[PDB]
Short mmCIF file of C-alpha atoms in Angstrom, two decimals:
data_model
loop_
_atom_site.label_atom_id
_atom_site.label_comp_id
_atom_site.label_asym_id
_atom_site.label_seq_id
_atom_site.Cartn_x
_atom_site.Cartn_y
_atom_site.Cartn_z
CA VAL M 4 83.76 75.55 134.11
CA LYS M 5 80.36 77.13 134.45
CA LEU M 6 78.85 79.47 132.39
CA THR M 7 77.02 82.80 133.19
CA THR M 8 73.51 83.06 132.01
CA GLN M 9 74.63 86.06 129.54
CA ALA M 10 77.50 83.51 128.15
CA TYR M 11 74.63 81.02 127.35
CA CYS M 12 71.94 83.41 126.56
CA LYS M 13 74.37 85.24 123.76
CA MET M 14 75.53 81.62 122.58
CA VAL M 15 72.05 80.34 121.73
CA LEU M 16 71.27 83.70 120.37
CA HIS M 17 74.00 83.88 117.92
CA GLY M 18 73.35 80.03 116.85
CA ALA M 19 69.76 81.13 116.31
CA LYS M 20 70.46 84.03 114.44
CA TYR M 21 72.23 82.04 111.92
CA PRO M 22 70.72 78.10 111.97
CA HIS M 23 71.92 77.16 108.62
CA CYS M 24 75.64 78.30 108.95
CA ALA M 25 78.34 77.42 111.87
CA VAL M 26 78.65 79.56 114.85
CA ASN M 27 81.90 80.40 116.72
CA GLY M 28 83.15 82.88 119.26
CA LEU M 29 85.45 83.42 122.22
CA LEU M 30 84.14 83.21 125.77
CA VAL M 31 85.91 85.65 127.85
CA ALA M 32 86.30 85.75 131.40
CA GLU M 33 87.26 87.98 134.55
CA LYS M 34 91.20 87.50 135.86
CA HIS M 51 86.64 77.30 139.38
CA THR M 52 86.56 79.34 136.16
CA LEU M 53 83.17 81.28 135.42
CA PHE M 54 82.18 82.30 131.85
CA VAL M 55 80.81 85.25 132.12
CA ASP M 56 80.19 86.34 128.44
CA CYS M 57 81.10 85.41 124.88
CA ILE M 58 82.24 87.53 121.87
CA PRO M 59 80.70 85.91 118.86
CA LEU M 60 83.25 86.14 115.85
CA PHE M 61 81.77 84.30 112.38
CA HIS M 62 79.89 82.14 110.66
CA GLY M 63 79.83 80.26 107.67
CA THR M 64 83.09 79.69 106.30
CA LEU M 65 85.40 79.50 109.43
CA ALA M 66 88.52 77.51 108.19
CA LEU M 67 90.33 81.17 107.33
CA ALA M 68 93.35 82.30 109.27
CA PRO M 69 93.67 86.11 108.82
CA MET M 70 90.15 87.31 110.00
CA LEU M 71 90.47 84.75 112.99
CA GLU M 72 93.92 85.96 113.83
CA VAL M 73 92.49 89.77 113.81
CA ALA M 74 89.73 89.13 116.30
CA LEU M 75 92.27 87.81 118.80
CA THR M 76 93.94 91.11 119.11
CA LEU M 77 90.81 93.01 118.65
CA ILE M 78 89.21 91.66 121.40
CA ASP M 79 92.16 91.47 123.53
CA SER M 80 92.54 95.17 122.91
CA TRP M 81 89.12 95.30 124.69
CA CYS M 82 89.40 93.14 127.49
CA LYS M 83 92.72 94.00 128.88
CA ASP M 84 91.08 97.99 129.36
CA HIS M 85 87.74 95.78 130.79
CA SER M 86 89.83 93.61 133.08
CA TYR M 87 89.04 90.57 131.08
CA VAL M 88 90.57 87.55 130.00
CA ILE M 89 89.68 84.99 126.93
CA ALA M 90 89.13 81.51 128.59
CA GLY M 91 87.43 79.40 126.09
CA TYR M 92 86.49 78.70 122.75
CA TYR M 93 82.65 77.41 121.48
CA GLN M 94 81.56 75.95 118.08
CA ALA M 95 78.43 74.91 116.45
CA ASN M 96 78.88 72.53 113.64
CA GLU M 97 76.46 73.30 110.23
CA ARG M 98 74.77 69.83 110.63
CA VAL M 99 72.52 68.95 113.43
CA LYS M 100 73.86 65.42 114.20
CA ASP M 101 77.96 65.80 113.91
CA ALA M 102 79.46 67.68 116.83
CA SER M 103 82.75 66.57 116.68
CA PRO M 104 85.55 69.18 116.79
CA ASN M 105 87.42 69.87 113.47
CA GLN M 106 90.97 70.74 112.98
CA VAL M 107 90.07 74.46 113.53
CA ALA M 108 88.57 74.10 116.98
CA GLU M 109 91.64 72.41 118.37
CA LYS M 110 93.87 74.96 116.59
CA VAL M 111 92.41 77.80 117.87
CA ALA M 112 92.26 76.18 121.67
CA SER M 113 95.94 75.34 121.26
CA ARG M 114 96.23 79.13 120.72
CA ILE M 115 94.55 80.08 123.93
CA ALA M 116 96.50 77.38 125.80
CA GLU M 117 99.54 79.40 125.49
CA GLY M 118 97.87 83.19 127.02
CA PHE M 119 95.43 81.15 129.41
CA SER M 120 95.52 77.92 131.42
CA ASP M 121 92.28 75.52 131.73
CA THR M 122 90.95 76.14 127.92
CA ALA M 123 87.28 74.55 127.43
CA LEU M 124 86.48 73.23 123.77
CA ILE M 125 82.82 74.19 123.70
CA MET M 126 80.44 72.26 120.89
CA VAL M 127 76.96 72.79 120.77
CA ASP M 128 75.11 69.74 120.03
CA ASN M 129 72.21 71.30 118.39
CA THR M 130 70.14 68.13 119.10
CA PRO M 139 72.46 69.63 127.92
CA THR M 140 72.75 69.97 124.08
CA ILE M 141 76.51 71.42 125.34
CA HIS M 142 79.67 69.25 125.21
CA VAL M 143 83.03 70.68 126.77
CA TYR M 144 86.15 69.19 125.66
CA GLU M 145 89.25 69.80 128.07
CA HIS M 146 92.94 68.86 127.36
CA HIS M 147 94.76 66.49 129.67
CA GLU M 148 98.07 65.58 128.07
CA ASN M 149 96.98 63.48 125.50
CA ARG M 150 93.64 64.87 123.45
CA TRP M 151 90.41 66.76 124.06
CA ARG M 152 88.03 64.48 126.15
CA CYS M 153 84.43 66.02 126.49
CA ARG M 154 82.45 65.80 129.93
CA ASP M 155 78.91 65.92 128.78
CA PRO M 156 78.50 61.86 128.49
CA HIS M 157 79.22 61.90 132.24
CA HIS M 158 77.75 65.22 133.67
CA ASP M 159 77.74 68.97 132.61
CA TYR M 160 78.30 71.58 135.43
CA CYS M 161 75.94 75.05 135.32
CA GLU M 162 75.25 77.55 137.90
CA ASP M 163 71.68 76.69 137.30
CA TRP M 164 69.58 75.32 134.36
CA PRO M 165 65.87 76.58 134.81
CA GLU M 166 67.09 79.96 135.18
CA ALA M 167 69.18 79.77 132.10
CA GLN M 168 66.41 78.00 130.20
CA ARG M 169 63.81 80.47 131.15
CA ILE M 170 65.70 83.69 130.36
CA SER M 171 67.01 82.20 126.87
CA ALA M 172 63.50 81.62 126.02
CA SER M 173 62.65 84.84 127.14
CA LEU M 174 64.70 86.38 124.66
CA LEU M 175 63.91 83.81 121.66
CA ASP M 176 60.36 84.30 121.70
CA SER M 177 60.76 88.14 121.17
CA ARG M 178 63.17 87.35 118.24
CA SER M 179 65.76 89.24 119.68
CA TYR M 180 68.63 87.03 117.85
CA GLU M 181 67.99 89.45 114.89
CA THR M 182 68.82 92.58 116.98
CA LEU M 183 72.04 90.43 118.07
CA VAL M 184 75.43 91.25 116.56
CA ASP M 185 78.70 89.64 116.21
CA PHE M 186 81.96 90.07 115.29
CA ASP M 187 81.69 89.27 111.20
CA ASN M 188 78.73 91.95 111.44
CA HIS M 189 81.02 94.57 112.74
CA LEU M 190 83.47 94.03 110.34
CA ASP M 191 80.69 95.04 107.96
CA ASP M 192 79.71 98.06 109.70
CA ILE M 193 81.65 99.47 112.61
CA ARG M 194 78.27 101.19 113.99
CA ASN M 195 77.74 97.60 115.77
CA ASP M 196 78.84 97.09 118.84
CA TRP M 197 80.59 93.53 119.22
CA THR M 198 80.44 93.66 122.89
CA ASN M 199 76.44 93.38 122.57
CA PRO M 200 75.56 95.70 125.50
CA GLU M 201 71.80 95.83 124.27
CA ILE M 202 71.51 92.21 124.53
CA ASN M 203 73.10 91.93 128.14
CA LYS M 204 71.39 95.15 128.97
CA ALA M 205 68.09 93.47 128.64
CA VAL M 206 69.48 90.27 130.55
CA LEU M 207 70.13 92.03 133.27
CA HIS M 208 66.49 93.25 134.16
CA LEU M 209 65.42 89.35 133.40
CA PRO L 3 58.89 114.60 91.74
CA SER L 4 56.31 112.27 90.04
CA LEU L 5 54.02 115.13 88.61
CA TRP L 6 56.33 114.88 85.09
CA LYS L 7 53.74 112.61 84.01
CA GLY L 8 50.74 115.28 84.05
CA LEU L 9 53.02 117.48 82.54
CA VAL L 10 53.31 115.57 79.36
CA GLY L 11 49.74 114.96 79.74
CA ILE L 12 48.86 118.98 79.77
CA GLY L 13 51.39 119.15 76.89
CA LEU L 14 49.48 116.87 74.46
CA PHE L 15 46.38 118.29 75.58
CA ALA L 16 47.58 121.66 74.55
CA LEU L 17 49.14 120.19 71.53
CA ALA L 18 45.72 118.22 70.23
CA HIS L 19 44.07 121.63 70.95
CA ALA L 20 46.95 123.97 68.84
CA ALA L 21 45.61 120.76 66.01
CA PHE L 22 42.61 121.42 66.34
CA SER L 23 42.76 125.51 66.08
CA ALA L 24 45.01 124.97 62.82
CA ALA L 25 42.38 122.65 61.33
CA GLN L 26 39.74 125.17 62.02
CA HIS L 27 41.76 128.03 60.75
CA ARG L 28 42.51 125.90 57.49
CA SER L 29 39.19 125.31 57.18
CA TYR L 30 38.09 128.95 57.23
CA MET L 31 41.11 129.96 54.80
CA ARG L 32 39.68 127.53 52.15
CA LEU L 33 36.27 129.05 52.80
CA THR L 34 36.86 132.25 52.01
CA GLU L 35 40.07 132.06 49.76
CA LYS L 36 42.45 134.56 51.13
CA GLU L 37 45.84 134.77 49.56
CA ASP L 38 47.70 135.43 53.00
CA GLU L 39 47.71 131.82 53.84
CA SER L 40 49.47 132.61 57.08
CA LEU L 41 48.71 130.70 60.70
CA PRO L 42 47.45 133.12 63.55
CA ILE L 43 50.65 133.72 65.89
CA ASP L 44 48.49 133.13 68.79
CA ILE L 45 48.23 129.31 67.92
CA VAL L 46 51.67 129.03 66.65
CA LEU L 47 52.68 130.26 69.93
CA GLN L 48 50.61 127.46 71.84
CA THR L 49 52.04 124.96 69.43
CA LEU L 50 55.63 125.89 70.16
CA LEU L 51 54.74 126.12 73.98
CA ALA L 52 53.11 122.81 74.14
CA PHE L 53 56.04 121.10 72.01
CA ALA L 54 58.84 122.59 74.39
CA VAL L 55 56.88 121.90 77.56
CA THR L 56 56.22 118.17 76.33
CA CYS L 57 59.48 117.50 75.21
CA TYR L 58 61.07 118.76 78.37
CA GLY L 59 58.56 116.20 80.04
CA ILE L 60 59.42 113.04 78.29
CA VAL L 61 63.16 113.95 78.47
CA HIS L 62 62.34 113.47 82.28
CA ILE L 63 59.77 110.81 82.53
CA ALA L 64 62.14 108.67 80.32
CA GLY L 65 64.40 107.24 83.48
CA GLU L 66 67.34 107.81 85.05
CA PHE L 67 70.57 106.60 83.84
CA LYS L 68 73.02 104.18 85.86
CA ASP L 69 76.46 104.10 86.34
CA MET L 70 78.70 102.03 84.22
CA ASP L 71 81.25 101.14 86.58
CA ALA L 72 80.54 97.48 87.80
CA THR L 73 82.20 98.13 91.12
CA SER L 74 79.66 100.42 92.29
CA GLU L 75 76.75 98.02 91.98
CA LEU L 76 78.81 95.71 94.54
CA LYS L 77 79.72 98.33 97.09
CA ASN L 78 76.86 97.25 99.22
CA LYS L 79 77.03 93.59 98.72
CA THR L 80 78.12 91.55 101.77
CA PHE L 81 79.71 87.70 101.92
CA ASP L 82 76.58 87.12 103.67
CA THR L 83 74.43 87.02 100.57
CA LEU L 84 76.82 85.66 98.42
CA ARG L 85 77.97 82.41 100.15
CA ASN L 86 74.47 81.27 100.01
CA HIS L 87 73.67 79.09 96.59
CA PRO L 88 70.05 78.42 96.46
CA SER L 89 70.94 75.17 94.43
CA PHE L 90 73.09 73.41 97.25
CA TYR L 91 70.30 74.34 100.14
CA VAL L 92 70.64 71.84 102.38
CA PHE L 93 67.82 71.30 105.22
CA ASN L 94 69.43 68.96 108.20
CA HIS L 95 70.55 72.14 110.05
CA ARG L 96 69.74 73.37 113.72
CA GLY L 97 66.69 75.55 112.38
CA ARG L 98 64.63 72.49 111.57
CA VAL L 99 65.32 71.40 115.47
CA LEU L 100 64.75 74.76 116.92
CA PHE L 101 62.29 76.83 114.78
CA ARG L 102 58.84 74.71 115.05
CA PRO L 103 60.34 70.87 115.39
#
């Protein structure tokens, strides 16, 4: 229900690296739930099955060895006003629900600025209209800007950039390595 | 290297000098009216060497060839530079509210 400064900073960095395009990834955690970090998957046209179902296994193979487990899924729509979840968000959340309970469907509202929908027997209903819980807002807002002003998103890499060149690390070592000292 | 241009320049200069030398020798032979009418091999060697050097230089300055296989030019392309259509651009994304509101 809470996100770590690393998860939030990686989310905002991937969202800023491709503003014109959509943003998607998988929030993975340790095995009440805290989102330690996210693995950003793709951008642009996301309504495609094979590359999305490859990321499932190619991230599980890393998390099972790194003692991690995938907990949630975030999406950022192309438009700046529309933040309603598409069919893809539901179809991916239902897939992780069968392997890990308490799945959170995150919608990055471009114009806080984050919605969290939870499934309770009927649908996916958000909680941001009522209230959204985080560990500490000012710390995250400071450390995010600290990496934003330096234009560090140009250095960030996601799974789509990794499928182009394997020399790129989808786990973002050089990002959280700077996050720890800030 | 990019020094081929200077090579063809020196070749053309030597060719012009050989042409001037041949003009001088022709003037001398028409002045003295000799029945030999044989160009000096000294200037003939210079003409041939300058011609060879200049031709070999312009063979290099002409520009390099390119592969015929189309699949070779798109081997470095990525879908991040093909999805974008400069005609159907839309400006109501998050970059407007994020970068310089």
